């Protein structure tokens, strides 16, 4: 997802005005990780009886 947004914005990126920090959007990655560790079925509530 981050790759796709990078490519999409790259067309509208002014050449020589862009750096990886301002070219990379981390939000999709953190969103995917957070939505996995919570509400993913294989990330189960620890069973401590």
């Amino acid at each position: 997802r981050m790759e796709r947004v990078v490519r999409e914005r790259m067309t509208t990126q002014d050449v020589e005005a862009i750096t990886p920090q301002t070219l990379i959007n981390i939000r999709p990655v953190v969103a995917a990780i957070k939505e996995f560790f919570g509400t993913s079925q294989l990330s189960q509530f620890m069973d401590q009886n």
């Binding site: 002014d14 020589e16 005005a17 750096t19 990886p20 920090q21």
Partner: protein, 159 residues
């Protein structure tokens, strides 16, 4: 032209201290790749000396440009197109050009307008970025340091 330890100006990151130069042989060609480091983004940029000027890298400007920018800050009678979009595009292209005079004129005009009646957030962002780069460039222009550079900007805008 390019010497170690020189505080060279690279657009659009402003000041950029050189470290060294590397052979970095590519296509069998030891294309010289001089390395710059900018304190703002903490990133390293390696550029070829042969076309370094083509990109737009420039050395620290002397006092001639300093007095030029002061006089330009005292240049009245500025008018812009009626539409906000056209003037925004014009000043954005002016900033992108990297010319110190153009960005200085954009900064002063936008600041006087904002202080005149207050505008918006996008213009505020443009003004902040352009003023930041200008203050850094001036700080190194007289090695007067960023804080004192900000203060001298604040006194000279008063006119």
């Amino acid at each position: 032209i390019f010497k170690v330890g020189d505080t060279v100006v690279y657009p659009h990151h402003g000041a950029a201290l050189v470290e060294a130069i590397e052979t970095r042989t590519i296509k069998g060609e030891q294309k010289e790749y001089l390395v710059l480091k900018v304190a703002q983004g903490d990133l390293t940029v390696r550029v070829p000396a042969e076309n370094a000027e083509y990109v737009g890298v420039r050395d620290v400007v002397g006092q001639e440009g300093l007095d030029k920018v002061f006089q330009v800050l005292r240049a009245p009678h500025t008018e812009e197109p009626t539409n906000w979009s056209r003037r925004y595009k014009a000043n954005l292209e002016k900033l992108a050009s990297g010319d110190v005079n153009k960005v200085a004129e954009v900064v002063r005009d936008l600041w006087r307008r904002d202080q005149e009646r207050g505008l918006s957030a996008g213009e505020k962002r443009m003004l902040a970025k352009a003023r930041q780069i200008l203050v850094g460039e001036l700080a190194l222009a007289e090695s007067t340091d960023d804080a004192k550079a900000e203060t001298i900007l604040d006194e000279v805008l008063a006119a």
